[PDB]
Amino acid sequence: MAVTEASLLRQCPLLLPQNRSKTVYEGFISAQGRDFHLRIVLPEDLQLKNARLLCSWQLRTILSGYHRIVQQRMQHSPDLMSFMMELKMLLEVALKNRQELYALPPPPQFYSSLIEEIGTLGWDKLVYADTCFSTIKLKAEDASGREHLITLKLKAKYPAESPDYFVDFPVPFCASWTPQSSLISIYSQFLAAIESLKAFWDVMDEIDEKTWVLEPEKPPRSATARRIALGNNVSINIEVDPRHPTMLPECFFLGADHVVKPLGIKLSRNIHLWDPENSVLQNLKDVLEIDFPARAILEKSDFTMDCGICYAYQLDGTIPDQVCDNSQCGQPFHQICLYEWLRGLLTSRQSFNIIFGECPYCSKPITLKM
Amino acid sequence: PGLAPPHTRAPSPLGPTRDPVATFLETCRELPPSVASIKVSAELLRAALKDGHSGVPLCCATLQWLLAENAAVDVVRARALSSIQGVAPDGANVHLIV
Amino acid sequence: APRVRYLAGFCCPLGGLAAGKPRVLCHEAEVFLSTGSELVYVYDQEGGLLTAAFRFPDQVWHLELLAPRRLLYALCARRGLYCLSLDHPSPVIPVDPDACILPDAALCAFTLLDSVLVTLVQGPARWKMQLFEQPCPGEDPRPGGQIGEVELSSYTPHFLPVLCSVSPSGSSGGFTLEDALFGLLFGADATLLQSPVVLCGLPDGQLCCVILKALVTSRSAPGDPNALVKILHHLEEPVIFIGALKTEPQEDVHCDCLVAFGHHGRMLAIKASWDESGKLVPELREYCLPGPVLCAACGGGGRVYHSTPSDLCVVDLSRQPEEGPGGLPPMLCPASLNICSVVSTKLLALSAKGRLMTCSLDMTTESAGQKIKELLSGIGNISERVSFLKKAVDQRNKALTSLNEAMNVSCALLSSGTGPRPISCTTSTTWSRLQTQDVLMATCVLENSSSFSLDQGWTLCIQVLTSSCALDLDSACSAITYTIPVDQLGPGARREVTLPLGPGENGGLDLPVTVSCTLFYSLREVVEQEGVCLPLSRHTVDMLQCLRF
Amino acid sequence: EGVEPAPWAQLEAPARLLLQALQAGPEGARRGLGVLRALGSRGWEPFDWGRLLEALCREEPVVQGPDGRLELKPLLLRLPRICQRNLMSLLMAVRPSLPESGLLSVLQI
Amino acid sequence: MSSNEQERLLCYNGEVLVFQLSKGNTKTPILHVRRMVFDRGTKVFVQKSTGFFTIKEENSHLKIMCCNCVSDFRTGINLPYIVIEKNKKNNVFEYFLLILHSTNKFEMRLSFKLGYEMKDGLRVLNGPLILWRHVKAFFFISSQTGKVVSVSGNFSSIQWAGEIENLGMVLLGLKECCLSEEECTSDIYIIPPAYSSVVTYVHICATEILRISLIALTRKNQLISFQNGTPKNVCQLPFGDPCAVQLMDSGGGNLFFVVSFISNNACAVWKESFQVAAKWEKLSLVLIDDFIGSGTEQVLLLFKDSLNSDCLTSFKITDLGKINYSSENRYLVVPPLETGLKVCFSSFRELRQHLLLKEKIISKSYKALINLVQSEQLVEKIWYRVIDDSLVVGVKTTSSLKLSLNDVTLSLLMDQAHDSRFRLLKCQNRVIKLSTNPFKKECVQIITAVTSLSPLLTFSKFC
Ligand SMILES: [Zn+2]
Ligand SMILES: [Zn+2]
């Protein structure tokens, strides 16, 4: 309703006015099928510019990082009615965010069905299950003999709504979810995607084996990019279409302008002799009229010796100088980039010509002396 | 009650779900509508209703003659209704069509 | 791996044992047990056989022990205090009254320090603490001369009061506090004297300390209590268990916090702060645990092992200083009352049944599948009951909503908004005819104008008051009353009731007659004397309504 | 009086590092690509992006407009407007390798 | 069971004692105790110790009659007892009461030596006190006394026997009658004589000062509460011919009544809501205790010896919650479930507090209404009589309320819980002024209503 005599009943059923002069309300407030104790003292008139509001310590843990919010809302909100709307809305927010603490599953469907269904698959399949039982991650095999993993993140109702599927491989995966579908169903869909992309995988595996793939290190199955090295201090980066893998990619070369120019010319001249009945390597070798190095150096292949903020060597004369005092990062930077960076952080403090604060990559103490 | 002149909120009686002695006994010890109809000659009904009061020949005048003895016949005379839903003394509903 | 055991069980009454009286102590491997009967037992903790059973007269109320001397002091109810040599020159043994010392007879509590004995004795109105010697040479077991006496004037009288001594650092079956605290609670005097201080818990719930040094008197020299006994903090409820705790743990441990408990379950732990004014302040914390509390103890590291009637539950204080609330788990043992804590944790108790019990706290193919089966069966047993409680909750909610509306109707009615909006009840006079005679009837129309649906729990009462001026002769029928359930009225909706007022007797109607309506709410119906009655209208029928032309 | 924490404070280190980076003017976009190659390199090779695209919808309250208005904002309209444009530009470039479910929560906003 | 070769079971101290007669050839059959404990490791009962007792005279028909834990009167320690019949075929039966100790050692305490054979309600009680009947002749022998005693009163059945505060020993055989076992012969607040015709077995649970809270169960397979003879919270039991109820506590509050039946089957029903939580069948026996060492009750359920001629095969032990034991990875799932198990329990234990909090708030708000509206007793008291087909209610004033100044009335109001229908209720108001011994001086003003009764006796009853 308009007025907060019926509208306040309808929108706060469990707030029982104790006093005749409706100054103390007491009892429960509702949110996400959960009721909370709440005791809300007004002054002698209906003015929230001055009011008390006490809570259960339950509710106060759940209003943590909102205290100023609520105090401002008491001062800024015209009526009690709207105040309660704002307060519920804010509870709404608070719980859904802290979703890790709050999940009472209906066992009779859940924990039994999930067991039945993992039995339906086979027990070699499942590889990880979380003790909140929210996450699972499953395994599948190629005709090749490659493992590909699938994460599922599951809700209070598994069989009702979709399970959130998180997947590696580079085309967007489609799972037709019904209430009738189950783990075996989405698993068969996932196998279908595997056996479909078989060619693209063979291309990637063939490359990684018979060449010095250099930049993506331990490649995922999602990566379309392969910065291959060849000769010395020249490289080719090659971005591939999965749907037509053997077909021609967008490509270009890094290194010496005097070394690369001839290869570009030669490529532009032989590029009509690309053929999607050969392999990518068997096309590249005879198009560019070359053989590749199979790991000319496997230990000191390359460590990216660039700024790790701006990713340039030679920013206005300056060199990658300032490093991390850490064995696991070692990452060089620039004087300019690291100063601009650390000034900005809240963790940074500046002494006379010194700036203390966190390495961008590893969050360990790093010192900059201007 | 629905047809009534005032159209006033009278509560529905709903005659008692058991006898008091029946409820006593149950405590101490522990579907379609039925229909009837008739047909009759228009000539018979015309000849009998002639002295013919007014209005539409049949169905309405038939109902006026059936309930000429009920107090709420003048109301059905005004609205000229050939089908109505009364209640009863025992609270059950009955719909009578002509 | 059996985290419990049983040694023995006892002659329990119906329900179980009465709390406060039964006692348990562990010495080394021997265990000293009283079941709040006249009988005190001693069990070998290796083999759960009784070493020794001791028949006193009349209900042992308390024990204490001295390990050095190998002696046990024991308060018979209406007799005095009997000491037993554990050497002790059928496995039942009667005590001879020679073992009696201070037959004071009226003594309710008593405790022990080193070389000093404290009783506390009921009298008239005034309870008096005393203080005796206890002979430090291994002699004839004597009291000595009483050193002193006081009157706990503060107290004027099931629950025995309780005694705990507390010595400060530098200086024994009691407790030691830290110099900061000790100085904080008791003051310089006791600090400077290095004076033990003896805490009495009183059935009032007052928690009183007295400095012992400061209690030496004679016939010439009576103790003034107003001086000599003082009062820390008044729990409004009786006392069960006093101790103290090593919060911040970083045999004689110097504690930094002081513990009480109540029956209904206010705790009160206390601390030294030294905060916010560059000055020492005490840290009070009046928590509220569950239920009847039925005993308590202390284990290493700010962990208080207490019992309610349902469950044996623990509180942690260990880390402003200590803590906001004490939210407080079971350990899935029943009500044991009478608990003790030996420190290594291995606690011994007496269960409410009669049970003397030791709580010692801290892959396979297809057998794991049977474990899986087990766990499933468990949750399914449980789920059934979580469901039940959900529906109880729904009931409580639905009750609250109806009540909510009731308050709202009542509030609306009891305010004068200058038009009686929410509910109205008009009455109006009507002549009818019966048999022969013109009867005078009153229609009572009840109308709901407002939104509020008058659900179940509501009832209309009409009363038909005759003439006024109570007479010489009290009439036949002074008034009549009519009371009807209003059920599910709803908004806009309406009832009518007709009453006679009219000459049934004698052809005699006396006119100025009021018919007054009311509503009444019954709180019970939807689930000291308890309802509410709210006025509606009161219409006066006078001749000018009762004329017929 | 005027200390504010960065609205990605409470995030997983790598996404924190991505979003810290895209702050950085129009070279935000490339920095971002650079950022991802220099996280493929490190121990946690995978980017559970739908961790971040959940995070990008997740709401909190802000009080702007008149001096008295509570609103709910998602992340996307809360972090720096230059990070907004640089983000979407980076998403275009990485579109193929995103789960659709999470992605359409963004576009709704 | 009861024979020369047969056993009987019992549970003492979270363990299980098996008393078996064994024909040992020189001599008579010997009583052998096995005292067994649940391993928890091997998921069985394993023999932890034994006892034996040599019987003397070479006469047959040695026979166990019953067994339990009793509480010796001398010490106050529970000891298992056992009743042996020795029959010489002489129309003479001995009846030993033996008590077996902490030490697996025996002690005679009655010989007791009857002529006629003992049957129906043999019932052992605390101060080891046997109590029996033949032809409605109740007798008891204390181990104190040592002599046959007769029960003075005359009763049919002996439905409860046991010790109460202030009284010492008691019997409820007829629900009026409530003996002493010192000066044989309060019957005031025992269950109604209405229930006297249907009650076949009682199990008391509390006594306060005189007020008993008490269970029954009937021939109708019912199960009822009483608090000062106020029947709340009735059940219905699945099976027929119920024998007994024992009790389980099983946690914070999870209190059950486990019912055993003549049909070799059993229920547990959950106090808090008198409801079948579970049913089992064929139940050779039932026993109620911590076999585990959890510190809270389980129930042992034994299934029939048709399986093997071996006793504690075909068992099942439960809490009817977390504990259940009984007679290709999957393991990564286990900690998830155990986390769930504990979480379900967690939610249980919270909801209970939550609900109490609601009750508390409800009470707050009742009192709030009554203080919303707004000390001296204006009214003595209520009384009522039935005249023939007239109810008269009346109330006696105090001097404070002046009928000179105040028109008063009185109504009656029907409980809508009973009155499902809108009957108007009419009540006639009479004021009575009587002078008390006029030959200040006492006037008595009383106020009183009358109505018809027969309308209100529609439901057998009303308030
Ligand atoms: Zn740079
Ligand atoms: Zn670093």
From Swiss-Prot, chain A:
Provenance organism: Homo sapiens (Human)
Reported effect, residue 149 to A: No effect on interaction with FANCI and FANCD2
Annotated zinc fingers (RING-type), start-end: 307-363
Subunit structure: Interacts with GGN. Belongs to the multisubunit FA complex composed of FANCA, FANCB, FANCC, FANCE, FANCF, FANCG, FANCL/PHF9 and FANCM. The complex is not found in FA patients. In complex with FANCF, FANCA and FANCG, but not with FANCC, nor FANCE, interacts with HES1; this interaction may be essential for the stability and nuclear localization of FA core complex proteins. Interacts with FANCI. Directly interacts (via the RING-type zinc finger) with UBE2T and UBE2W.
Post-translational modification comment from the UniProt entry: The RING-type zinc finger domain is monoubiquitinated in the presence of UBE2T and UBE2W.
Gene label: FANCL
Name listed for the protein in its UniProt record: E3 ubiquitin-protein ligase FANCL
Impact noted for substituting residue 311 to A: Loss of interaction with UBE2T
Transmembrane segments: none
Comment block on domains: The UBC-RWD region (URD) region mediates interaction with FANCI and FANCD2.
Keyword annotations from UniProtKB, A to Z: Acetylation, Cytoplasm, DNA damage, DNA repair, Fanconi anemia, Metal-binding, Nucleus, Transferase, Ubl conjugation, Ubl conjugation pathway, Zinc, Zinc-finger
Mutagenesis or variant effect for residue 309 to A: Loss of interaction with UBE2T
UniProtKB/Swiss-Prot annotation, chain C:
Major subcellular site: nucleus
Localization terms from the record: Nucleus
GO biological process: interstrand cross-link repair
Signal peptide range in chain numbering: none
Keywords annotated in UniProt: DNA damage, DNA repair, DNA-binding, Nucleus, Phosphoprotein
GO-annotated molecular function: DNA binding
Entry GO terms, CC: chromatin; cytosol; Fanconi anaemia nuclear complex; nucleoplasm
Residue spans crossing the bilayer: none
Function: Plays a role in Fanconi anemia-associated DNA damage response network. Regulates FANCD2 monoubiquitination and the stability of the FA core complex. Induces chromosomal instability as well as hypersensitivity to DNA cross-linking agents, when repressed.
Subunit relationships: Belongs to the multisubunit FA complex composed of FANCA, FANCB, FANCC, FANCE, FANCF, FANCG, FANCL/PHF9, FANCM, FAAP24 and FAAP100. Forms a subcomplex with FANCB and FANCL.
Identification of the protein by name: Fanconi anemia core complex-associated protein 100
Organism field: Homo sapiens
Lineage, opening ranks: Eukaryota, Metazoa, Chordata, Craniata, Vertebrata
Parent-record interval covered: 5 to 655 of 881
From Swiss-Prot, chain D:
Keyword annotations from UniProtKB, A to Z: Disease variant, DNA damage, DNA repair, Fanconi anemia, Nucleus, Phosphoprotein, Ubl conjugation
Subcellular location: Nucleus
Principal subcellular localization: nucleus
Post-translational events: Phosphorylated. Ubiquitinated. Phosphorylation by CHEK1 induces polyubiquitination and degradation.
GO cellular-component term (any): chromatin
GO biological process: gene expression; homeostasis of number of cells; interstrand cross-link repair; ovarian follicle development
Assembly behavior: Belongs to the multisubunit FA complex composed of FANCA, FANCB, FANCC, FANCE, FANCF, FANCG, FANCL/PHF9 and FANCM. The complex is not found in FA patients. Interacts with FANCC and FANCD2.
Protein function: As part of the Fanconi anemia (FA) complex functions in DNA cross-links repair. Required for the nuclear accumulation of FANCC and provides a critical bridge between the FA complex and FANCD2.
Disease note: Fanconi anemia complementation group E: A disorder affecting all bone marrow elements and resulting in anemia, leukopenia and thrombopenia. It is associated with cardiac, renal and limb malformations, dermal pigmentary changes, and a predisposition to the development of malignancies. At the cellular level it is associated with hypersensitivity to DNA-damaging agents, chromosomal instability (increased chromosome breakage) and defective DNA repair.
Name recorded for this polypeptide: Fanconi anemia group E protein
Gene name of the encoded protein: FANCE
Portion held of the full protein: 12 to 120 of 536
UniProtKB/Swiss-Prot annotation, chain E:
Gene Ontology CC annotations of this record: chromatin; cytosol; Fanconi anaemia nuclear complex; nucleoplasm
Biological process annotations from GO: interstrand cross-link repair; negative regulation of double-strand break repair via homologous recombination; positive regulation of double-strand break repair via homologous recombination; replication-born double-strand break repair via sister chromatid exchange
Sorted UniProt keywords: Acetylation, DNA damage, DNA repair, Fanconi anemia, Nucleus
Source species of the chain: Homo sapiens (Human)
Function: DNA repair protein required for FANCD2 ubiquitination.
Spans traversing the lipid bilayer: none
Source species taxonomy: Eukaryota, Metazoa, Chordata, Craniata, Vertebrata
Subunit annotation: Belongs to the multisubunit FA complex composed of FANCA, FANCB, FANCC, FANCE, FANCF, FANCG, FANCL/PHF9 and FANCM. The complex is not found in FA patients.
Disease: Fanconi anemia complementation group B: A disorder affecting all bone marrow elements and resulting in anemia, leukopenia and thrombopenia. It is associated with cardiac, renal and limb malformations, dermal pigmentary changes, and a predisposition to the development of malignancies. At the cellular level it is associated with hypersensitivity to DNA-damaging agents, chromosomal instability (increased chromosome breakage) and defective DNA repair. Some severe FANCB cases manifest features of VACTERL syndrome with hydrocephalus.
Stated name of the protein: Fanconi anemia group B protein
Main location: nucleus
Compartments it resides in: Nucleus
